[PDB]
Amino acid sequence: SGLEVLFQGPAGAFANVKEDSLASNIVYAPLYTYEKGNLVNYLAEKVDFKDSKELTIKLKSNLKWHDGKPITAEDVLFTFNTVLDEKQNSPSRQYLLVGEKPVKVEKIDDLTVKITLPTASESFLYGISKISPIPKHVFEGESNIAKSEKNNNPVGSGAFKFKEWKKGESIVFEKNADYFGGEPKADSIALKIIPNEASQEAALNNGEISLMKTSAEGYEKAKSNSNLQTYTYSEERLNYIVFNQNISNMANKEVRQALSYALNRNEMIESAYGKEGSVPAKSILVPEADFYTEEGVEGYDQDTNKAKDLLDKSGVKIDKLKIGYNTGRFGHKNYALVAQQELKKIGIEAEIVPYESKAFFNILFSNSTECDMYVNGYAWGLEPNPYRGMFETGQYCNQTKYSNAEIDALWEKGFTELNKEKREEIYKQIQQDISKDAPIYTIDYEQNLMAAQKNLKGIKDAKPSPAILFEDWSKLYVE
């Protein structure tokens, strides 16, 4: 009665469990999780957000770290303080800022902490959900919580504790006898590394692994197999092409609109997913995000005639473009090749430029004119505010120079608007008005293609989730 999961990622992600979002969420429980305004408590007993300004969080009593130490407000205060500490360079630090000013965090009592926002925003609750407590008694000494020796035997709060490891092969977690919730339904989780992909498929067909993410090929295969079950879930990620408005031709709205009419997200999707396909995207927000809508959102549905007619009307003349992509990302090579085939049909010779992942982001987040167009993906979360990173004038993640002062103003308005229904109208307007500017060609909301044994139960209850794979591993079991 143990789960075995194909682990796809860094060989030494297991060497530092806190460094890997999948293993981290097995070992470290959140305070709460967030979905469409709704909170589910894990370590928290009570979460109260008063006046969009003061977040009070009380822990359940009798919580233990995996080493027996109590979980108290000291651990929660320590965790937020560590994230706020700029010397720690926490990626979660954005979630404890309001504008560029930090929130204040204080101990209220033994189990309770209060966060006070410098200015009130409804944008706050989702971000705090992404910070899971770490133990003060383990990490208080440490100049670098991320790359600390103290991560070696990880001391967690979660439904499973570290049991044993085997460098770049295996890591096993045993059910936590002391878990605060209902006794986990599986005795252990093994993450197994199997680089050989036929072995991956054999391991799945042979029942040596409970679950894997698969190719478009592998998904269709698994569907024909009487023993396996299949499912897909959102990565909560938008794949798109950004127009590099450092280049005068791309800075031209009519040209961007035209090239959008020449492209086809449905052909790109098929190239990457086969006939299973994906979820075609028109909006800058993912479907799972607060205030997502496609209503009045322009998608530039392919129309080669209208493309050439716009290109002609713009006065601009293009016979050559460059499209860059990250060789390290699913689907992006395919999206580039298809973009090329579709551009030739309106008289444009698009060169494809592969980039390794580090070089890619270094060129994307620059004012470089190397490529006219970059294929990219983002995952900004369920609150729409930080999406402004790709669209608001002057943003680091918008050195591709999309500028609309009116939409810039809407972003800020949405951030300060405390009324939920008003927020919804503002983000609706942002999704509509951005689509009218075609700063990007939106391709799909990326979907994960999963195969498991017919006898893996509790999948729905475990809640398939981006990067962590499941929200609650305690719900999974083999029949």
Side-chain angles (χ1 to χ4, degrees), residues 1-17 20-146 148-166 168-316 318-453 455-479:
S1 172
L3 306 167
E4 323 185 299
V5 177
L6 179 67
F7 181 86
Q8 292 137 286
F14 298 170
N16 195 341
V17 153
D20 180 86
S21 43
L22 192 152
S24 202
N25 174 76
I26 292 168
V27 162
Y28 295 101
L31 295 162
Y32 65 89
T33 64
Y34 184 93
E35 176 168 291
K36 292 291 188 182
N38 301 315
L39 276 62
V40 170
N41 286 350
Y42 286 80
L43 291 175
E45 182 191 303
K46 295 217 172 58
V47 175
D48 267 77
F49 199 32
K50 170 157 167 273
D51 299 324
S52 299
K53 210 192 150 56
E54 286 175 27
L55 184 54
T56 296
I57 301 173
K58 186 171 88 159
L59 289 171
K60 296 165 144 124
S61 47
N62 299 134
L63 294 175
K64 312 305 197 213
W65 302 109
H66 291 162
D67 67 6
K69 295 317 221 299
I71 315 190
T72 79
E74 283 305 323
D75 295 305
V76 180
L77 184 66
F78 174 74
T79 296
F80 293 140
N81 280 347
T82 290
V83 168
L84 273 164
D85 186 341
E86 294 195 56
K87 290 197 256 49
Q88 291 284 343
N89 296 115
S90 164
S92 301
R93 185 170 185 270
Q94 85 197 74
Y95 301 131
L96 292 183
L97 304 182
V98 174
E100 271 88 277
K101 328 191 54 152
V103 308
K104 155 196 190 192
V105 187
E106 69 185 283
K107 175 153 160 205
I108 286 305
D109 68 19
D110 195 59
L111 300 183
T112 309
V113 145
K114 189 210 284 185
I115 311 188
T116 301
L117 280 57
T119 54
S121 187
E122 270 305 310
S123 69
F124 195 68
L125 267 218
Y126 170 67
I128 294 289
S129 92
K130 306 312 299 198
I131 304 171
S132 305
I134 60 188
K136 187 180 202 178
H137 76 280
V138 170
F139 287 107
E140 60 192 334
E142 300 292 304
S143 55
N144 190 344
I145 272 85
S148 174
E149 211 71 347
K150 285 279 171 58
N151 287 306
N152 277 333
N153 161 52
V155 169
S157 54
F160 300 78
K161 18 179 104 170
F162 168 88
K163 168 183 157 91
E164 62 166 339
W165 172 49
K166 268 142 267 150
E169 179 217 285
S170 191
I171 183 167
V172 181
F173 313 87
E174 48 174 50
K175 78 165 159 204
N176 175 9
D178 294 328
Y179 181 61
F180 58 85
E183 186 187 353
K185 297 191 191 179
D187 295 322
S188 57
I189 302 163
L191 311 181
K192 300 202 227 174
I193 326 197
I194 307 179
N196 183 322
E197 302 173 38
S199 314
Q200 296 181 3
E201 194 182 4
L204 179 61
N205 295 119
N206 297 330
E208 294 160 56
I209 56 162
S210 321
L211 182 70
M212 71 184 285
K213 190 182 193 259
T214 64
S215 66
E217 289 209 80
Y219 191 68
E220 244 64 76
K221 270 156 150 167
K223 285 167 66 58
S224 325
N225 182 334
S226 146
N227 302 140
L228 305 188
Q229 61 178 309
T230 52
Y231 76 92
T232 75
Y233 73 93
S234 305
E235 191 57 21
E236 301 184 346
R237 169 187 172 90
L238 177 66
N239 300 307
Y240 65 92
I241 303 165
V242 58
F243 299 106
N244 183 3
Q245 303 199 37
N246 293 292
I247 296 160
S248 52
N249 281 359
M250 307 291 96
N252 185 307
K253 175 157 114 143
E254 295 179 329
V255 173
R256 282 199 309 281
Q257 280 168 338
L259 285 169
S260 299
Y261 284 122
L263 289 171
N264 199 324
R265 65 178 55 97
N266 299 133
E267 300 187 49
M268 286 162 191
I269 282 164
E270 257 204 59
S271 179
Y273 291 85
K275 22 185 180 51
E276 172 55 26
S278 192
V279 182
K282 300 179 166 180
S283 177
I284 59 150
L285 302 191
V286 301
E288 294 71 24
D290 289 349
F291 311 132
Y292 168 89
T293 177
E294 201 151 45
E295 197 197 280
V297 173
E298 180 59 55
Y300 300 98
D301 287 336
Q302 174 170 55
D303 182 352
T304 298
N305 255 27
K306 181 170 277 164
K308 270 171 302 199
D309 174 296
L310 258 49
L311 222 84
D312 166 55
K313 253 57 186 306
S314 83
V316 172
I318 321 174
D319 75 324
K320 283 199 211 196
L321 294 179
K322 284 190 156 63
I323 301 159
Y325 76 96
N326 194 326
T327 65
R329 292 300 182 281
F330 169 79
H332 287 197
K333 186 195 172 58
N334 308 56
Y335 292 181
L337 290 179
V338 171
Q340 176 170 62
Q341 280 143 2
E342 304 182 321
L343 284 176
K344 185 165 288 204
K345 281 163 189 63
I346 61 160
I348 300 160
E349 169 176 35
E351 177 195 347
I352 297 314
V353 186
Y355 288 94
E356 303 311 287
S357 187
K358 282 192 186 68
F360 175 80
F361 288 116
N362 283 344
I363 196 92
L364 182 54
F365 305 134
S366 83
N367 62 4
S368 173
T369 62
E370 203 157 320
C371 302
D372 301 285
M373 279 165 290
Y374 301 100
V375 184
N376 196 42
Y378 61 50
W380 277 119
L382 301 186
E383 200 281 329
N385 186 53
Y387 285 76
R388 70 202 285 174
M390 253 68 186
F391 304 109
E392 179 180 21
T393 296
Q395 282 287 350
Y396 180 85
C397 297
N398 181 32
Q399 296 169 68
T400 43
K401 298 280 192 307
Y402 174 47
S403 204
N404 189 319
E406 285 187 286
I407 301 185
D408 288 337
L410 285 186
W411 282 122
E412 195 46 26
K413 192 188 171 182
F415 179 71
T416 52
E417 179 49 63
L418 299 185
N419 191 291
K420 176 149 189 227
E421 293 67 38
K422 292 231 289 232
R423 294 201 76 209
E424 183 176 354
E425 283 316 306
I426 294 152
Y427 290 106
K428 183 171 215 184
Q429 193 178 346
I430 291 166
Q431 287 169 88
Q432 294 170 339
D433 299 342
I434 291 188
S435 57
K436 291 166 176 200
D437 289 345
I440 65 175
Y441 187 76
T442 60
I443 298 171
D444 70 308
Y445 305 124
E446 183 155 315
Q447 298 294 314
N448 293 302
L449 274 40
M450 303 300 291
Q453 304 299 325
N455 57 17
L456 186 59
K457 301 290 95 162
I459 296 192
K460 57 303 297 169
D461 288 319
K463 317 205 341 84
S465 287
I468 66 185
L469 198 64
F470 299 97
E471 189 181 294
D472 190 0
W473 285 88
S474 70
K475 297 319 195 211
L476 287 167
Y477 65 93
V478 180
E479 195 58 76

mmCIF file of all heavy atoms in Angstrom, residues 282 293-299 428-429 431-436:
data_model
loop_
_atom_site.group_PDB
_atom_site.id
_atom_site.type_symbol
_atom_site.label_atom_id
_atom_site.label_comp_id
_atom_site.label_asym_id
_atom_site.label_seq_id
_atom_site.Cartn_x
_atom_site.Cartn_y
_atom_site.Cartn_z
ATOM 1 N N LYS A 282 -7.176 32.955 -25.498
ATOM 2 C CA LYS A 282 -7.279 34.337 -26.035
ATOM 3 C C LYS A 282 -6.938 35.355 -24.953
ATOM 4 O O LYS A 282 -6.439 36.450 -25.306
ATOM 5 C CB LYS A 282 -8.678 34.572 -26.614
ATOM 6 C CG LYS A 282 -9.009 33.614 -27.753
ATOM 7 C CD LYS A 282 -10.401 33.774 -28.351
ATOM 8 C CE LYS A 282 -10.543 33.037 -29.671
ATOM 9 N NZ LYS A 282 -11.897 33.184 -30.260
ATOM 10 N N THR A 293 -12.047 35.780 -18.095
ATOM 11 C CA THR A 293 -13.175 35.800 -19.057
ATOM 12 C C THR A 293 -12.602 35.901 -20.466
ATOM 13 O O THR A 293 -11.500 36.456 -20.617
ATOM 14 C CB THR A 293 -14.178 36.929 -18.767
ATOM 15 O OG1 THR A 293 -15.169 36.903 -19.794
ATOM 16 C CG2 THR A 293 -13.565 38.310 -18.744
ATOM 17 N N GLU A 294 -13.348 35.353 -21.424
ATOM 18 C CA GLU A 294 -13.106 35.385 -22.889
ATOM 19 C C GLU A 294 -14.117 36.331 -23.557
ATOM 20 O O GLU A 294 -13.984 36.605 -24.762
ATOM 21 C CB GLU A 294 -13.282 33.969 -23.421
ATOM 22 C CG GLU A 294 -12.596 33.726 -24.740
ATOM 23 C CD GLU A 294 -12.171 32.280 -24.884
ATOM 24 O OE1 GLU A 294 -12.988 31.392 -24.556
ATOM 25 O OE2 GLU A 294 -11.016 32.048 -25.277
ATOM 26 N N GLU A 295 -15.110 36.792 -22.802
ATOM 27 C CA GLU A 295 -16.168 37.687 -23.325
ATOM 28 C C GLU A 295 -15.540 39.004 -23.800
ATOM 29 O O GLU A 295 -14.996 39.749 -22.960
ATOM 30 C CB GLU A 295 -17.240 37.940 -22.268
ATOM 31 C CG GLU A 295 -18.528 38.485 -22.848
ATOM 32 C CD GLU A 295 -19.403 39.103 -21.786
ATOM 33 O OE1 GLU A 295 -20.094 38.335 -21.075
ATOM 34 O OE2 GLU A 295 -19.363 40.349 -21.656
ATOM 35 N N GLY A 296 -15.662 39.292 -25.094
ATOM 36 C CA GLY A 296 -15.217 40.557 -25.710
ATOM 37 C C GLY A 296 -13.713 40.576 -25.829
ATOM 38 O O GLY A 296 -13.149 41.681 -25.964
ATOM 39 N N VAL A 297 -13.091 39.387 -25.764
ATOM 40 C CA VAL A 297 -11.621 39.203 -25.884
ATOM 41 C C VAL A 297 -11.303 38.749 -27.308
ATOM 42 O O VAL A 297 -11.716 37.645 -27.709
ATOM 43 C CB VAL A 297 -11.086 38.227 -24.822
ATOM 44 C CG1 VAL A 297 -9.622 37.920 -25.052
ATOM 45 C CG2 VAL A 297 -11.319 38.782 -23.423
ATOM 46 N N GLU A 298 -10.551 39.578 -28.034
ATOM 47 C CA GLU A 298 -10.205 39.330 -29.449
ATOM 48 C C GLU A 298 -9.130 38.246 -29.501
ATOM 49 O O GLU A 298 -8.089 38.407 -28.831
ATOM 50 C CB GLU A 298 -9.770 40.631 -30.134
ATOM 51 C CG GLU A 298 -9.413 40.421 -31.588
ATOM 52 C CD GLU A 298 -10.567 39.858 -32.406
ATOM 53 O OE1 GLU A 298 -11.639 40.497 -32.380
ATOM 54 O OE2 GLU A 298 -10.396 38.777 -33.036
ATOM 55 N N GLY A 299 -9.364 37.208 -30.306
ATOM 56 C CA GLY A 299 -8.434 36.081 -30.507
ATOM 57 C C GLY A 299 -7.800 36.068 -31.884
ATOM 58 O O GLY A 299 -6.896 35.265 -32.097
ATOM 59 N N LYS A 428 -11.924 42.338 -16.366
ATOM 60 C CA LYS A 428 -12.644 42.085 -17.643
ATOM 61 C C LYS A 428 -12.146 43.094 -18.688
ATOM 62 O O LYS A 428 -11.730 42.669 -19.761
ATOM 63 C CB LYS A 428 -14.154 42.174 -17.421
ATOM 64 C CG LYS A 428 -14.984 41.858 -18.653
ATOM 65 C CD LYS A 428 -16.453 41.745 -18.343
ATOM 66 C CE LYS A 428 -17.128 40.692 -19.183
ATOM 67 N NZ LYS A 428 -18.588 40.668 -18.935
ATOM 68 N N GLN A 429 -12.150 44.386 -18.348
ATOM 69 C CA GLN A 429 -11.764 45.493 -19.267
ATOM 70 C C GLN A 429 -10.296 45.320 -19.685
ATOM 71 O O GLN A 429 -10.000 45.485 -20.900
ATOM 72 C CB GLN A 429 -12.032 46.856 -18.617
ATOM 73 C CG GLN A 429 -11.955 47.992 -19.628
ATOM 74 C CD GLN A 429 -12.256 49.360 -19.067
ATOM 75 O OE1 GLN A 429 -12.782 49.522 -17.962
ATOM 76 N NE2 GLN A 429 -11.898 50.370 -19.840
ATOM 77 N N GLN A 431 -8.518 42.478 -19.814
ATOM 78 C CA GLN A 431 -8.429 41.311 -20.725
ATOM 79 C C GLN A 431 -8.912 41.685 -22.132
ATOM 80 O O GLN A 431 -8.302 41.224 -23.129
ATOM 81 C CB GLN A 431 -9.216 40.144 -20.141
ATOM 82 C CG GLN A 431 -8.513 39.518 -18.953
ATOM 83 C CD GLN A 431 -9.397 38.551 -18.222
ATOM 84 O OE1 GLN A 431 -9.451 37.373 -18.558
ATOM 85 N NE2 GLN A 431 -10.106 39.063 -17.230
ATOM 86 N N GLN A 432 -9.989 42.465 -22.222
ATOM 87 C CA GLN A 432 -10.544 42.944 -23.522
ATOM 88 C C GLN A 432 -9.574 43.915 -24.188
ATOM 89 O O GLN A 432 -9.152 43.655 -25.349
ATOM 90 C CB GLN A 432 -11.893 43.629 -23.312
ATOM 91 C CG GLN A 432 -12.956 42.658 -22.838
ATOM 92 C CD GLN A 432 -14.217 43.343 -22.399
ATOM 93 O OE1 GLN A 432 -14.228 44.524 -22.078
ATOM 94 N NE2 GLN A 432 -15.295 42.579 -22.372
ATOM 95 N N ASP A 433 -9.201 44.985 -23.477
ATOM 96 C CA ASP A 433 -8.412 46.088 -24.094
ATOM 97 C C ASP A 433 -7.009 45.589 -24.430
ATOM 98 O O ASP A 433 -6.497 45.982 -25.477
ATOM 99 C CB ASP A 433 -8.437 47.358 -23.241
ATOM 100 C CG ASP A 433 -9.855 47.872 -23.083
ATOM 101 O OD1 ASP A 433 -10.707 47.456 -23.887
ATOM 102 O OD2 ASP A 433 -10.100 48.627 -22.144
ATOM 103 N N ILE A 434 -6.428 44.691 -23.642
ATOM 104 C CA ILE A 434 -5.079 44.158 -23.997
ATOM 105 C C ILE A 434 -5.202 43.367 -25.301
ATOM 106 O O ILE A 434 -4.295 43.519 -26.157
ATOM 107 C CB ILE A 434 -4.428 43.377 -22.839
ATOM 108 C CG1 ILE A 434 -4.052 44.332 -21.706
ATOM 109 C CG2 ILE A 434 -3.238 42.557 -23.319
ATOM 110 C CD1 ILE A 434 -3.237 43.697 -20.602
ATOM 111 N N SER A 435 -6.260 42.559 -25.479
ATOM 112 C CA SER A 435 -6.403 41.707 -26.691
ATOM 113 C C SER A 435 -6.494 42.601 -27.935
ATOM 114 O O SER A 435 -5.907 42.239 -28.961
ATOM 115 C CB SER A 435 -7.566 40.728 -26.619
ATOM 116 O OG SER A 435 -8.804 41.385 -26.395
ATOM 117 N N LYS A 436 -7.135 43.758 -27.814
ATOM 118 C CA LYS A 436 -7.251 44.769 -28.902
ATOM 119 C C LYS A 436 -5.878 45.330 -29.296
ATOM 120 O O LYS A 436 -5.758 45.762 -30.432
ATOM 121 C CB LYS A 436 -8.230 45.868 -28.480
ATOM 122 C CG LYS A 436 -9.666 45.376 -28.406
ATOM 123 C CD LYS A 436 -10.610 46.302 -27.679
ATOM 124 C CE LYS A 436 -12.045 45.821 -27.722
ATOM 125 N NZ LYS A 436 -12.982 46.936 -27.445
#
